[PDB]
Amino acid sequence: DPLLAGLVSLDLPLDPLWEFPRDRLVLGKPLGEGCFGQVVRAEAFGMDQASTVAVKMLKDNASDKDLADLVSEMEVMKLIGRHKNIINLLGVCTQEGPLYVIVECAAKGNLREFLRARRPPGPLSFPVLVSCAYQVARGMQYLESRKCIHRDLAARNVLVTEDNVMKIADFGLLPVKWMAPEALFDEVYTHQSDVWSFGILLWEIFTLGGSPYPGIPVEELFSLLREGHRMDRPPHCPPELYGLMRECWHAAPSQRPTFKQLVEALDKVLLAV
Ligand SMILES: *CCC(=O)Nc1ccc(CN2C(=O)N(c3cc(OC)cc(OC)c3)Cc3cnc(Nc4ccc(N5CCN(C)CC5)cc4)nc32)cc1
């Protein structure tokens, strides 16, 4: 791999808006596993005193394509801007050392595992669940306003902080069960296909980390969706929230709610409870 094998130093351009001093960073233990590169917990000073963050870097066997992908993800996160319910870029280290991309840490892991660990034989009351759904819709509303189509919205892609704040990951760049029909069949992706995926995520939330379309092989999902198959109401789900899911899975993208409406609708349920 030319660039990584050939250069003693990697002369990425200095962006002063984002560059973070390496000596104010303390690298710690690895985070998750290793399918999306190498990510570690770290402490960052003066983001005065410390705070916990997550740091992505190249695995020691990275290819030039891994380098390009890390850089591109970095660049995309710079343009998207900050919001409470997404994993935010906090800084980069590009000058005179290894490439480090510093983002927000979410101590409790992804939403699917958070929910499943806390299943009852309470903790996952109706208000907690609606709050999860609400927070994710707010993040998606933000992303949509920044013209960012996620394309892989799922509970495994939503991370949970120490304070139970939902944060969407992988906004900057088997998934088939989260894909809208127009994306499944015609590889078309729009904000309204993210809304479909959000419907699946909603079902995920109210089955407390359940797996979508249980018992069904991915190969048959094509025709099943074509024949108009839809998942049924989760036991932990009032008919009015199920109505929301079903609307998100409208065959016609224009007849699905927008994220603005999902936020307003879920906000209402929260005030009531
Ligand atoms: C192949 C499956 C797999 O390994 N998935 C996976 C890998 C790594 C992470 C960790 N991340 C993460 O990648 N973050 C991130 C980086 C980044 O780079 C620019 C961009 C992002 O979105 C745009 C996100 C962020 C992040 C924030 N917090 C956490 N916290 C975390 C805490 C605990 C855990 N656990 C996982 C599993 N188990 C059993 C216990 C605890 C994971 C993550 N992580 C990341 C996530 C998934």
Curated annotation (Swiss-Prot):
N-glycosylated. Full maturation of the glycan chains in the Golgi is essential for high affinity interaction with FGF19. Ubiquitinated. Subject to proteasomal degradation when not fully glycosylated. It is found in: Cell membrane; Endosome; Endoplasmic reticulum. Coiled coil: none annotated. It comes from the Eukaryota. ATP binds at L31, G32, E33, G34, C35, F36, G37, Q38, V39, K56. Residues 3-273 are cytoplasmic. The active site is at D152 (proton acceptor). Expressed in gastrointestinal epithelial cells, pancreas, and gastric and pancreatic cancer cell lines. Residues 25-273 form the Protein kinase domain. Monomer. Homodimer after ligand binding. Interacts with FGF1, FGF2, FGF4, FGF6, FGF8, FGF9, FGF16, FGF17, FGF18, FGF19, FGF21 and FGF23 (in vitro). Binding affinity for FGF family members is enhanced by interactions between FGFs and heparan sulfate proteoglycans. Interacts with KLB; this strongly increases the affinity for FGF19 and FGF23. Affinity for FGF19 is strongly increased by KLB and sulfated glycosaminoglycans. Belongs to the protein kinase superfamily. Tyr protein kinase family. Fibroblast growth factor receptor subfamily. It is linked to FGFR4 variants may be involved in the pathogenesis of various cancers. It has been found in prostate cancer as well as cancers of the breast, colon, head and neck, larynx, lung, skin. Tyrosine-protein kinase that acts as a cell-surface receptor for fibroblast growth factors and plays a role in the regulation of cell proliferation, differentiation and migration, and in regulation of lipid metabolism, bile acid biosynthesis, glucose uptake, vitamin D metabolism and phosphate homeostasis. Required for normal down-regulation of the expression of CYP7A1, the rate-limiting enzyme in bile acid synthesis, in response to FGF19. Phosphorylates PLCG1 and FRS2. Ligand binding leads to the activation of several signaling cascades. This is Fibroblast growth factor receptor 4. It comes from Homo sapiens (Human). The gene is FGFR4. The chain holds residues 445 to 750 of 802 of the full protein.
